[PDB]
Amino acid sequence: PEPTIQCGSEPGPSPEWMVRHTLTPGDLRDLRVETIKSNVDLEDSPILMNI
Amino acid sequence: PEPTIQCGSEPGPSPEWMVRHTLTPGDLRDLRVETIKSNVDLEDSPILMNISWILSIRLLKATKICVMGKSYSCIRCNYTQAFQTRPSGGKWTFSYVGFPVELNTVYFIGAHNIPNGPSMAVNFTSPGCLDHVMKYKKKCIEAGSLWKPNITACKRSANTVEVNFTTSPLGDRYMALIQSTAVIGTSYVSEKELTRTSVVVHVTGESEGAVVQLTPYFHTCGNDCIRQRGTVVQCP
Amino acid sequence: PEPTIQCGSEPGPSPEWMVRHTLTPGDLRDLRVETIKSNVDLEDSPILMNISWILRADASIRLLKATKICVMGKSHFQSYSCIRCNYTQAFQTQTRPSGGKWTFSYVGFPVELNTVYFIGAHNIPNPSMAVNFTSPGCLDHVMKYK
Amino acid sequence: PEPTIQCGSEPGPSPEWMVRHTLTPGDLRDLRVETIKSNVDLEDSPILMNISWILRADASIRLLKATKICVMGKSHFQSYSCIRCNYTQAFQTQTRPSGGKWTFSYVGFPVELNTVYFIGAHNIPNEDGPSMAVNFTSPGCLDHVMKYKKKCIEAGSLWKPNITACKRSANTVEVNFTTSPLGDRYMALIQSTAVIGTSYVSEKELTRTSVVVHVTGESEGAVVQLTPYFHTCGNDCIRQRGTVVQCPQTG
Amino acid sequence: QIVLTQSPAIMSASPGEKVTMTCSASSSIYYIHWYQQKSGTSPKRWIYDTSKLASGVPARFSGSGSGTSYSLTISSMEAEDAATYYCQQWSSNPFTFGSGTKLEIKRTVAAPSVFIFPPSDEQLKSGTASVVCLLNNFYPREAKVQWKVDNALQSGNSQESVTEQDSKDSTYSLSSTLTLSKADYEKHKVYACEVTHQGLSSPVTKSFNRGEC
Amino acid sequence: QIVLTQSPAIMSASPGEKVTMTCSASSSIYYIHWYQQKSGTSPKRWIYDTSKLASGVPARFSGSGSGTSYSLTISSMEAEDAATYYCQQWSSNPFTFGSGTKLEIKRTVAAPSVFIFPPSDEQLKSGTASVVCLLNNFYPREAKVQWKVDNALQSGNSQESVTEQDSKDSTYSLSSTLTLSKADYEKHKVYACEVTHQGLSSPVTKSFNRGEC
Amino acid sequence: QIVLTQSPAIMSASPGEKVTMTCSASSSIYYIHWYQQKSGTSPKRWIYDTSKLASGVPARFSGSGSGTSYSLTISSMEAEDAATYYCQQWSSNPFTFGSGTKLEIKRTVAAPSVFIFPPSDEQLKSGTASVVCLLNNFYPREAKVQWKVDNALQSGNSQESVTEQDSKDSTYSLSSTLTLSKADYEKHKVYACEVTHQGLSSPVTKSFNRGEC
Amino acid sequence: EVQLQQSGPELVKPGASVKISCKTSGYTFTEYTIHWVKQNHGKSLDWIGGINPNNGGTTYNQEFKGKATLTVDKSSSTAYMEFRSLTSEDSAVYYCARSYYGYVDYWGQGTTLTAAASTKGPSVFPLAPSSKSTSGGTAALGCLVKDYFPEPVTVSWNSGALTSGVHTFPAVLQSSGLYSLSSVVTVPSSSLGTQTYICNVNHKPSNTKVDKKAEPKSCD
Amino acid sequence: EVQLQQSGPELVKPGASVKISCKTSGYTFTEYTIHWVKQNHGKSLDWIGGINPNNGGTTYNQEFKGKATLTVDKSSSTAYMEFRSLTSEDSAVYYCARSYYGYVDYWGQGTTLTAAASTKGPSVFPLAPSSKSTSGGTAALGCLVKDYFPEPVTVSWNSGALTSGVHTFPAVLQSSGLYSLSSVVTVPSSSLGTQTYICNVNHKPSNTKVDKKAEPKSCD
Ligand SMILES: *[C@@H]1O[C@H](CO)[C@@H](O[C@@H]2O[C@H](CO)[C@@H](O[C@@H]3O[C@H](CO[C@H]4O[C@H](CO)[C@@H](O)[C@H](O)[C@@H]4O)[C@@H](O)[C@H](O[C@H]4O[C@H](CO)[C@@H](O)[C@H](O)[C@@H]4O)[C@@H]3O)[C@H](O)[C@H]2NC(C)=O)[C@H](O)[C@H]1NC(C)=O
Ligand SMILES: *[C@@H]1O[C@H](CO)[C@@H](O)[C@H](O)[C@H]1NC(C)=O
Ligand SMILES: *[C@@H]1O[C@H](CO)[C@@H](O)[C@H](O)[C@H]1NC(C)=O
Ligand SMILES: *[C@@H]1O[C@H](CO)[C@@H](O)[C@H](O)[C@H]1NC(C)=O
Ligand SMILES: *[C@@H]1O[C@H](CO)[C@@H](O)[C@H](O)[C@H]1NC(C)=O
Ligand SMILES: *[C@@H]1O[C@H](CO)[C@@H](O)[C@H](O)[C@H]1NC(C)=O
Ligand SMILES: *[C@@H]1O[C@H](CO)[C@@H](O)[C@H](O)[C@H]1NC(C)=O
Ligand SMILES: *[C@@H]1O[C@H](CO)[C@@H](O)[C@H](O)[C@H]1NC(C)=O
Ligand SMILES: *[C@@H]1O[C@H](CO)[C@@H](O)[C@H](O)[C@H]1NC(C)=O
Ligand SMILES: *[C@@H]1O[C@H](CO)[C@@H](O)[C@H](O)[C@H]1NC(C)=O
Ligand SMILES: *[C@@H]1O[C@H](CO)[C@@H](O)[C@H](O)[C@H]1NC(C)=O
Ligand SMILES: *[C@@H]1O[C@H](CO)[C@@H](O)[C@H](O)[C@H]1NC(C)=O
Known part of the structure; x- marks a missing residue:
């Protein structure tokens, strides 16, 4: 765990770079997403992605 | 990590040295071009060329690039340094970003070194407003x-x-x-x-x-x- | 059909081809030797080497046509002979379909008492394979009947 | 293999193009020598050299018409054993059509026991040292074939x-x-x-x-x-x- | 473009022995998957994501590996395991399978029972004579059959066919069919099938004389 | 202009074995490109820029080299790899191709079945006699066919034709046609085709007598 | 007479990347041989007879070629591979080497730590003043050092020295030595070393005032 | 439960095109890729291509590009594959299959495609038991099934009652282009005079069914 | 998708002109060079020349300059090659192909040109099955297609209905300059009395179609 991450808002490529025209190979599984409650025990909280 | 380039305009030796009526061998690849969206947002962006070239004569002081749109404009890129050929593990490569790209236009680009069709040349026809880069042109948007x-x-x-x-x-x-x-x-x-x-x-x-x-x-x-x-x- | 070996005597090269001056990796155990009683019904049957080798399962086995085996005994003096075993057919699979890898053995080279034996083998076309053993003396349970 | 060799007795050398260099370049190895028994039926059969060579796969092979071979005894001896092998036709391909290289062999040159032989070969026409060269010590009375010769027995x-x-x-x-x-x-x-x-x-x-x-x-x-x-x-x-x-030796 | 090389292509194991088979990728993949297929049915997912067992698959099976090298291991061979096992990757397009490891059951040597069948009269009406030699319930698979007609060796006029391992006793059976014109068949008297097999000390010969019921 | 010398011109390899073929340029080029062509269809881009695989080419193929020296390698031969491979350059005008490596499938030896055909009466009524000898389903390609007319060995009056490798069993078939004037055919009696092949221990002869049924 | 041309003269490769270096002979040779040399020791035989690996050489290395064109290849760069590689021929006299490919290992960018050292009083007593600026443990090697004396840029009175890549962390260190007479040195107050490097967003300056500890 | 049900077999002249279907049920059709796999008889598995039912995106094994086309119909939860200009090399079982990651978790049952320029039913001849040399314990008898096309034939004995001891051999392609096989059974030799043995041969491509009684030959 | 569509085969008298075409689609015509390639029966590929469609700029293999002429029509996205004075040496398959950089990434399907001053239809003679063409229950029979010019002929059997071992040998050049070909089939010897075998010979250059029934010889 020696390297950690410092994250910020960055310019990225045009969103066409995400439009694959073939099938994605099903075992390219390095990236996962699941939703998390921002404030637990609290009701109407924003829902965040944990990528 | 290499010698740098400072580029400016310069007149050109008339559009006859580039568009000859013979074929240049297709594996002479020292000159490369790609179309790029300069602005990172999703609004209107200028569309420019990324012209790259690879540097076997040893040293040099300038490389000249001319682009013809069917327009005719040339750039002269002076090298601020030189090394008496390839210090990094890649080759020796430089790129110039410029020359706004118009819709549905054929582009002739030729280059020659100073001091020294031409061996460095690339041609390409630009697409229209359905293209993923050119659709960000102001007129397309x-x-x-x-x-x-x-x-x-x-x-x-x-x-x-x-x-x-x-x-x-x-x-x-x-x-x-x-x-x-x-x-x-x-x-x-x-x-x-x-x-x-x-x-x-x-x-x-x-x-x-x-x-x-x-x-x-x-x-x-x-x-x-x-x-x-x-x-x-x-x-x- | 499956390949077997047809073995015969060969003149062979000088025993210097057997001097490995680089060490071959120790976990290359494709060549084995053990002694067997040639006739079990006899009290004093000749003692022979049963030399076994394994053929590596890769591309090159399909081009293999023969295996050469040379034995040098060092005791009170040197002895030195060679055999060439020709494979009867070409190899269709890189391992035997009713076993594991390809293993073959040649029985021969009578064994003398108290001798250190160097055995080297090489495939044709191309010591790649090597094994030694020191034969026991008159206190060994098998050699004592000599 | 369409082109063949007809070999003959031309001298036409000099024991100096064989010693053009005191050291011969160590990678001139397209030339091999191995001893062969003249007669199988005999134990005291005469021993000959089987000199074989492979030809370079390049465009100059089209200009090749003969290969010259000289064997030198080196024992304060001179050469005077050269052969010239003429190729019967021109070479159309840089390799055989199903052949690693163009290969030829000549059998000749009676061999003495325990003798050092320098063999050099040169293509005709064409540098002007040996195109191919090999050193060779003939076997002695300990070799598996030479041991049955009368002088060894x-x-x-x-x-x-x-x-x-x-x-x-x-x-x-x-x-x-x-x-x-x-x-x-x-x-x-x-x-x-x-x-x-x-x-x-x-x-x-x-x-x-x-x-x-x-x-x-x-x-x-x-x-x-x-x-x-x-x-x-x-x-x-x-x-x-x-x-x-x-x-x-026992316990 | 990734190709998967499986070794061995064919192998046999006795019940209770340890079995390993390998799958080698031409370049690196994220996972390997294994399917079991028995003659006449669809492949079944067996080990997936390199080392996970599909539900119900016996725990004597295991998978391991990484990069370009993977293997499937059976700690102790069972007769229900005889099958063809394929590896498979989809880390790059195209999705690819390996060429497969066919795993058979090793058993004790068993010599064939040999039978020879003359051509039927029904067939001879058509002009052709098929002579059939049967080698029944033998092991291992390797066997040589030579035809003799009036003690003359035949060649080029016979075809052999071999069954898969019997589900009950793990033996093979073999047919050799010698085909002749009626003309040539009625010219000779003694038709013989000579069988060579590890389970026979000397070749067994079975024969009939033409027209001697 | 760059000439591309390919070696070997023709070769055969058994399925699963490693294959190398070389392409040597008369002067240095920046890249070599390779095309695969199976008989009767267009070449396909196969390896380009010396070492890149065209879309669809299995990674058992690889290309390497530089300057004047290049090679194409198949790590493990597959049956579908049987083809002609041409290397190619356009670093200099003119654009040039190599002379091609024809890659065939090696298989076990198979002896030919020999058949012979007399001239038809229809051809005789027209003035010429063609006698046809057929060698069916043999391997390897090398075969010697000698015609004998009343036991006199013939030469110069026959032509051979050979098929491509069969798609199923990888064998060749060959026809040899002996042509005579109607006068010469009707002057002699015994027409024989004598076949020498690796799969036959001694040369096999098929013959007929003119006017037999 | 034959000479050998090697390309590239110098290159750096990312860990894991495929490396090729070429050797071109002025005319055709029978073999090429490759030697590895790490700084301060003798060259060692590495690949010989064009494609054979000396004992102990990693199998990630291979050699190929023929005629006038040869190359040495590393399938996946390792830090241990960084060294100078010379090709060599003895198909003709004289025995010759190529001029070598110096292969270095790429790592992540790292900015130098900059230190400036005033001249010692022992040295000034002798009449000369050496001011040393140290750039420590940076990557990549390219860096600009500018001396300023009371804000006057210096030129022609400094020399640089650069270490080889560190075996452990793959960085470089650099010294720049500004040398002055005692006379000129004692006329000024502010001695500054200004460093430009890819790992620094803005140039770093280190300074001291003469005679202040 | 998840099920992939494929359309039935097709016997087709070389050069024709065919479209086979794969009916899925028990899960949300659009969430999983559908794959197609070719298997020649007794040989290896070849991926043809796959389709994402959500967007209709496809990818093919380039050996099948042009030859095969994949489609889906979301309303029926069905996948389709069109194979054009069939050759004899295309005779094979064809599977559809479901993936989510890189592995296949459910397979269809397979669809056999057979390329035949003609069909031909077999002749069935007896392999009459060597009653002339009875005893020694077990006798063998059988049926020779000759000269049919294309594959396969089915052989049972006594209308399916006799299974033990039955060996039906793989078909062999004769040099005539037609197939042949034998089916044999071993029985006690003393059963030759008491039991009836009939081989029932079925060749669906030609709608030929042949029953042949195999009897010991007249001995006295 | 990229496609290069070539015109059909041509039979042309020597000395006349012929122009074969390459209809491209699926990409921007002006961005890619078009190449033309000759392939004789010698199987070697010979580059003829290339053209930049943008300006019609060309470079030729000098063995073809002034024999072949390359042109483009930008409006139809079509490339053309014209032989204005065809000789017998020009009979061959001709390909068009597209390049970017030094390699060709898409090929046309090929155009056969046959240079013939005259045509001659073949005589078709039977190769009658007999015991000397029988082996292992297999009878060989065929058709000898003799003395035609120019190539090619096609031979089918029983109008495509025949499933059998088929061997159609490549044509052989006779010393007269006319061609000859044999087509042979292997069939069960037991079928020679109930099944009929007809070879269907087509020689398009002479508009000759011949069906020839092949039967075993029988004595008067
Ligand atoms: C030199 O050393 C080699 C081994 O390195 C010996 O070779 C072995 O020989 C023994 C018998 O001498 C064999 O044992 C036999 O195994 C048969 C099974 O064969 C399969 O399984 C073995 C593994 O156990 C494989 O090696 C083999 O290739 C097959 O895959 C049994 O069925 C045998 O019994 C049979 O023979 C006897 C009569 O001989 C019959 O009565 C039996 O009913 C039955 O038919 C026997 O158990 C062993 O397989 C051999 N191994 C190898 C690797 O070859 C040589 O014998 C030895 N040389 C000398 C002179 O001793
Ligand atoms: C990450 O690094 C880039 C490049 O050095 C820099 O521009 C950016 O600000 C950094 N982001 C953060 C969150 O520090
Ligand atoms: C999601 O869909 C897009 C568009 O088809 C595709 O490019 C991407 O790879 C898909 N991702 C997954 C995980 O299926
Ligand atoms: C490049 O150099 C020329 C000649 O020295 C000079 O005239 C020109 O202005 C320079 N261009 C730039 C952009 O500095
Ligand atoms: C660019 O166009 C010119 C003029 O037609 C031509 O000579 C040249 O071959 C083209 N460039 C390339 C890389 O083909
Ligand atoms: C320009 O092209 C080169 C070559 O691909 C690339 O490395 C470089 O990053 C490009 N620059 C930009 C701004 O796109
Ligand atoms: C093996 O082959 C070699 C070379 O063909 C031959 O000299 C030798 O006699 C053969 N030996 C046997 C035992 O067959
Ligand atoms: C050599 O002599 C010793 C002692 O007499 C004997 O044991 C041995 O067998 C002999 N060896 C040979 C090779 O004759
Ligand atoms: C070879 O050619 C040379 C010169 O043409 C001639 O002197 C010699 O006799 C020839 N030898 C043979 C064997 O033909
Ligand atoms: C043969 O000996 C000479 C003289 O020592 C030497 O220069 C030469 O390199 C040797 N040949 C080879 C192939 O090493
Ligand atoms: C000489 O050696 C070569 C190389 O092995 C061999 O091919 C040739 O047959 C030999 N000459 C003979 C045996 O006469
Ligand atoms: C269109 O919008 C209306 C109103 O929200 C909605 O009821 C209807 O389902 C929508 N129909 C379609 C086809 O999107």
């Missing part, structure tokens, strides 16, 4: 190149079609058209709000599986706006 | 004395061996880093004899060398070797 209305068209009765679509901030008027073997319905729509709206078009024949055509009348495209198509389907 | 090449030698005392070695019908006189020698002992034996019978060698050094693991004094070989007969062992 103003014709609706980035509009994603997400048309859903649903057969309600024997003579009605429900058409849903998301409006564009570029304009307020749209014409929805239903067509099988002939046009069976039309609606001209006014919508000031940016939302996914709904419209009923009165149809005279069988409207199931017909084409729906949405024509936007943005003030900048007149009668030449990019039209959007969908299909009438049944309802859930 | 009569020097004891097939003598099997079956030497057993045992460290008896701190300064004595007992050497046993079987004599030969080829002679009656023998010398037994014990050698480690230097010769540490010698004994001479006279025995007229074909028997298994025994002799004590008094040694001046450590004898365990030393070499025993048996020199027989057979006719025709004088003092240059084939020596037989063994090694000294600790006796008794």
